[PDB]
Design a protein around this ligand. Structure first.
Ligand SMILES: O=C(O)[C@H]1CCCN(c2ccc([N+](=O)[O-])c3nonc23)C1
Length: 129
């Protein structure tokens, strides 16, 4: 359901989200005008999510319910746990007593990414490439 190549088509509140996470202005400026592709693949237990953009490429590979070390696009060193809850991929990142949740869900033709940090929610919609 998640496997594919996905292109960003809309975004709400992403600058506020990155500011709440603690991302500096210059990174927010280039990350916000980026229009990434998200490439999701699976082989057995291992899910890979790639983000490709002219700002930064990133990749995570993980097993559901197995905490892993992640370096984010903004260079945060986080402890990440991804689970699959009612069709939703729920990704929690924990660092310095803080946390952020990124939910990836399939709604109609879209892949919806909901990013929560404290009182800020950002919603990013992707469509198949
Ligand atoms: O995949 C998506 O659409 C977004 C999900 C939430 C995490 N994403 C982010 C991207 C980039 C930067 N950055 O600062 O360059 C972030 N900083 O915080 N979060 C960031 C991508």
């Amino acid at each position: 359901a998640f496997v594919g190549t996905w292109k960003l088509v809309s975004s709400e509140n992403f600058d506020d989200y990155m500011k709440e996470v603690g991302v500096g202005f210059a990174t927010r400026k280039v990350a916000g005008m980026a229009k990434p592709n998200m490439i999701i693949s699976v082989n057995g237990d291992v899910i890979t999510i790639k983000s490709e953009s002219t700002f930064k490429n990133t990749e995570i590979s993980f097993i559901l319910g197995q905490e892993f070390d992640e370096v984010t696009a903004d260079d945060r060193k986080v402890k990440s746990t991804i689970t699959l809850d009612g069709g939703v991929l729920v990704h929690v990142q924990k660092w310095d007593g803080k946390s952020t949740t990124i939910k990836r869900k399939r709604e109609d033709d879209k892949l919806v990414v909901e990013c929560v940090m404290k009182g800020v929610t950002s919603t990013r919609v992707y469509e198949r490439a």
